[PDB]
RNA sequence: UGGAUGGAACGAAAAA
RNA sequence: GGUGAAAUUCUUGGAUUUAUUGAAGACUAACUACUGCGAAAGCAUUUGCCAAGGACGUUUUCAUUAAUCAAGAACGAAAGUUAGGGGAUCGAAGAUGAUCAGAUACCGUCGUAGUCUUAACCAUAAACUAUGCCGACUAGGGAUCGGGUGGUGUUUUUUUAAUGACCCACUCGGCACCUUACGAGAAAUCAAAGUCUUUGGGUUCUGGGGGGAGUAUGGUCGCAAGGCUGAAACUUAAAGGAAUUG
């Protein structure tokens, strides 16, 4: 059971039917140079750092 | 929908890879590179004799490699392989074509498309259907915006394309033809002898489709490849 | 009363336009009544052209375009956030944004 | 009701009239 | 030096096919649709389910000696959509970050020269 | 240089 | 495979998929636009044959031979009928799976008649520009199609000529478009829906509150569905058009 540790770089904005969750653009840690788009559940800003349990997958962005 | 079947066997395991052997794919002599690529067959055993499995394969591959020059980048190329000679089964050509990408973008409005096609046969007895295509061109100092031809202007372009295809095919047996088209000198016709009639920017031509062949004769097809 | 001079299509002088079929819901509409619209975009994504670029041979290769055309009925254009509507003297304005 | 489906049922009143009028004669 | 197959990506809406072939094509080799590795009949055109598809296809491609691939990618065509399904470039970018190289990518989602008939009727699909 | 369709929802006594 | 989500359906007798061929029928994509032709319906692959047509050019001919039309006549979308052929796709009826209190409806899978063609019929449409035809006059702007004229204009041929394709100016005939309203209108709007109380260029057709009713009856055409002409008794104070505020 690997995990990824990612940085957050840059806040998006909220999304959802009822603005529960925030979409965030985060870095990961190891072999930086690659940013990803993903959906946070609770109070996040910018510099925090997540664990995801799987690291190929891109949210749907709205824009 | 992994667990859906309702009933897998209408009535009531072994690698398939094991058994499988590779094969280098031979261009003929009408182009920069040899080396096509590679496939894979069955043994061939008592009862397949994998050469006939062989005998009716079509590849394309793109020009561009065969070429090296990066300009013939579209330009698909079909080959027939006919012969396997100990792992280096050989090819010649069946048929060439353009990529969707760039024929969409042949095609633009607000100007005139004109089309045309034949059915020339070959010395070689081989019979073939070329098309050509053309679309006006807007010269330099135009003001209007949109630039069309005039319905007759396409009628004679057309009939000057026609007669031309097969005064160039007629007389040539295959091969020359083919290495008149790699440095695409027929289009290169087309507009000294359409400039009179109108501009017609971008002549190339299309793609071009076989028809009919005759028989085998090996010795022609091995002098391709020496 | 009269809503549009042209009466919500582009036939002056012809009678009959050889209707084609939407391509989402296939209703049959008139060519000219139709609402067709280019769509042209590259193959990829703005986001993978890095990934591919990085994982594939001839470098610089083309990332060739692709080309469709879009007709869509009256109904299904509002549906899907295109033109949607525009107030009574703004309808007239006939320029693209 | 539409006047589509007014001439409709208005025709087939006509012909069972028709018919039933041809019965006699 | 190096070694092709060709990719053959179907984009259909409500499913994803993914099936690499020998460069003649009439060999096959792993094929894998992202309908079997979900269990949801309303995810089989996900773009997780196709990249989760596309990985397994890119292992036995890897496993079997196929190192790079030709792509084709294609729509239902036809009468249908024309438009490529969600699922199939989520699929692209899966399988070429699995590490196969990548090149002289096309489309051949089959067009008509105006076929027959484009069906449900005059007044088209109502709801 | 982007992108989503997306379930069900009948009726309201007469006059002012 | 299908949807919002599923199911009917097909799959170890290998479905969906991939390659090489072959057959059948339908259509003529992208080029395709406030562009063209036709009396209207309508007409979009190439080439050949047959006849037809508008506009332009004209110091050619006849000489008023003309405009509109009761009666009468040709053409006339789709659907439909009869008899052959063809019969891929789609698909009234129908069979089926869903939703729902019910759902013989919308949604899904099949599926006869039909969709295509030959020989005949039928003669209707929101057949719409809801604006009859001919003739004259009245405000400005550009663009476009066909033809003709002028210009040391540009490009290409053979620097060069004639051509051709463009540029500038002009004109005739078209499909229209942009601004304004002297003018018209109840208004929406209109270069005609203007030159109408300061009421008259020529001419055909239609209407007199809403229903009953395009019904009944009588003629006439058709094998049939139906078409053309077309009432009355009785009932009712409002129906209706365009705009304003909610
Ligand atoms: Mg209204
Ligand atoms: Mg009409
Ligand atoms: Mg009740
Ligand atoms: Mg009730
Ligand atoms: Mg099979
Ligand atoms: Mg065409
Ligand atoms: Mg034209
Ligand atoms: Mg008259
Ligand atoms: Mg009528
Ligand atoms: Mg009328
Ligand atoms: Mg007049
Ligand atoms: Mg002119
Ligand atoms: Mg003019
Ligand atoms: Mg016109
Ligand atoms: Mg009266
Ligand atoms: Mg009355
Ligand atoms: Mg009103």
């Not at chain 2, 009939?159 to 020359?176: D, F, H, M």
């Not at chain 3, 375009?65 to 295109?82: D, E, G, P, Q, W």
């Not at chain 5, 598809?53 to 729509?75: L, N, S």
Request: aromatic share 4%; hydrophobic share 35%.
């Amino acid at each position: 059971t690997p995990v990824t540790l990612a940085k957050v770089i840059k806040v998006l904005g909220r999304t959802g039917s009822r603005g529960g969750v925030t979409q965030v653009r985060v870095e990961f840690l190891e072999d930086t140079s690659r940013t990803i788009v993903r959906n946070v559940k609770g109070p996040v800003r910018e510099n925090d750092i997540l664990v995801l349990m799987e690291s190929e997958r891109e949210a749907r962005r709205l824009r | 929908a992994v667990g859906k079947n309702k009933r897998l066997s209408k009535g009531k395991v072994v690698d398939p890879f094991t058994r499988k052997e590779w094969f280098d794919i031979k261009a003929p002599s009408t182009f920069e590179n040899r080396n096509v690529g590679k496939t894979l067959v069955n043994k061939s055993t008592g009862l397949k004799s994998a050469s006939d499995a062989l005998k009716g394969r079509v590849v394309e591959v793109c020009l561009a490699d065969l070429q090296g020059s990066e300009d013939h980048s579209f330009r698909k190329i079909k080959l027939r392989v006919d012969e396997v000679q100990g792992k280096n089964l050989l090819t010649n050509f069946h048929g060439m074509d353009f990529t969707t990408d760039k024929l969409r973008s042949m095609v633009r409005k607000w100007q005139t498309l004109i089309e045309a096609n034949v059915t020339v046969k070959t010395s070689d007895d081989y019979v073939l259907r070329i098309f050509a295509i053309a679309f006006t061109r807007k010269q330099a100092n135009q003001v209007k915006r949109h630039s069309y031809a005039q319905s007759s202007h396409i009628r004679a372009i057309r009939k000057v394309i026609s007669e031309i295809l097969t005064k160039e095919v007629q007389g040539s047996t295959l091969a020359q033809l083919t290495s008149k088209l790699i440095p695409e000198v027929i289009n290169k016709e087309i507009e000294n002898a359409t400039k009179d009639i109108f501009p017609l920017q971008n002549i190339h031509v299309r793609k071009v489709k076989l028809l009919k062949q005759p028989k085998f004769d090996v010795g022609a097809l091995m002098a391709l490849h020496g | 009363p009269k809503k549009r001079a042209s009466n919500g299509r582009n036939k002056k002088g012809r009678g009959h336009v050889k209707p084609v079929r939407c391509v989402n819901c296939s209703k049959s509409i008139p060519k000219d009544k139709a609402i067709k619209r280019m769509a042209i975009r590259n193959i990829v994504e703005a986001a993978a052209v890095r990934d591919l670029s990085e994982a594939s041979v001839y470098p610089e290769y083309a990332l060739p375009k692709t080309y469709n055309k879009l007709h869509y009925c009256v109904s299904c254009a509002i549906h899907a956030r295109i033109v949607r509507v525009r107030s009574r003297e703004d309808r007239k304005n006939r320029a693209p944004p | 009701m539409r006047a589509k489906w007014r001439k409709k049922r208005t025709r087939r009143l006509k012909r069972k009239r028709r018919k039933v009028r041809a019965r006699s004669k | 030096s190096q070694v092709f197959g060709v990719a053959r990506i179907y984009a259909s809406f409500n499913d994803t096919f993914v099936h690499v072939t020998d460069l003649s094509g009439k060999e096959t080799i792993a094929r894998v649709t992202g309908g079997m590795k979900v269990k949801a009949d309303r995810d089989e055109s996900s773009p997780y389910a196709a990249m989760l598809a596309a990985q397994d296809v890119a292992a036995k491609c890897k496993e079997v000696g196929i190192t790079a691939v030709h792509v084709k990618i294609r729509a239902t065509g036809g009468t249908r959509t024309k438009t490529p399904g969600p699922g199939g470039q989520a699929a692209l970018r899966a399988l070429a970050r699995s590490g196969l190289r990548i090149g002289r990518i096309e489309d051949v989602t089959p067009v008509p020269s105006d076929s027959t008939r484009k069906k449900g009727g005059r007044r088209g699909r109502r709801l």
